[PDB]
Amino acid sequence: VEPVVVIDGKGHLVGRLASVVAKQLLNGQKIVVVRAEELNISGEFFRNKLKYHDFLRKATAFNKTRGPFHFRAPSRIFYKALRGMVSHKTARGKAALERLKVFEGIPPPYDKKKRVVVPQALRVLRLKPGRKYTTLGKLSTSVGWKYEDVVAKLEAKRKVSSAEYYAKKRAFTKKVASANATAAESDVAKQLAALGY
């Protein structure tokens, strides 16, 4: 439908999100994601951790170097589980990696257009009233990610800039609504409300 689909990682579910994303890229869709640190896990701080701990102890016995790669980046974290459900081995899955793009926060070109969501992939919707979970931002920090407040400093400058522009936009739509109401109830307004609009 559009040249590219922008994805909002805040408030979604880890593995289920990649699944639907996967299908769309294999159908012909270039895609860029933002704020992957805000992807929400489930369970306790303790649990989700030790799983990464035992994943952390499994590496090529004779060559820790040319074997398994672990990540502190919440973005290539999504890269990991999603590439592991396709064949990155053929030119097929190689071109799918090249279509896909993930980011730590919402960079310069990608926040000048809006991002979207999904219900069947939403954390809030697939969560029963009164359940536990863990967030990547906090656990990314406990695993070895030295960039929490460095990037929490970036989101500060950012959320201010985006709200200043919606200040002008919220007021400019107050102009559009007060021009459409004075020109309303006329001859072309009556005839159009009948056609279905």
């Binding site: 102009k175 020109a183 056609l195």
Partner: protein, 136 residues
Amino acid sequence: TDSIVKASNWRLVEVGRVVLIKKGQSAGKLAAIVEIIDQKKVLIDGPKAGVPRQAINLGQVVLTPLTFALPRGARTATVSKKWAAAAVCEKWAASSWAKKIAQRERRAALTDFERFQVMVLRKQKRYTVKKALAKA
């Protein structure tokens, strides 16, 4: 200075509250609660629409903030007896809820010739609103 704890307005499950069917043999008709069974299933009945008094799930029907007075056990007669004795018909199509339906309902029944009329009446509609957002 006092308390103030929001509003917390919800649609309560009761005998007299009406809902909108999305799927089944109706898939777009109305029916009100006659009796309550449990948590997800209830008993409906809507004569002014053409639908039966049937056991049904909450996952196949929606809600409305419209409630009128009704006896606990009132069959088909008392069902539309209090329907008209409350004036819920004019109170129903009195909201943007059902205006939204007829809007896209008439869009799926639009010819390219009448769809052509919408395009042209809007050519002149947006012209006056541009000479409006230019001087005010």
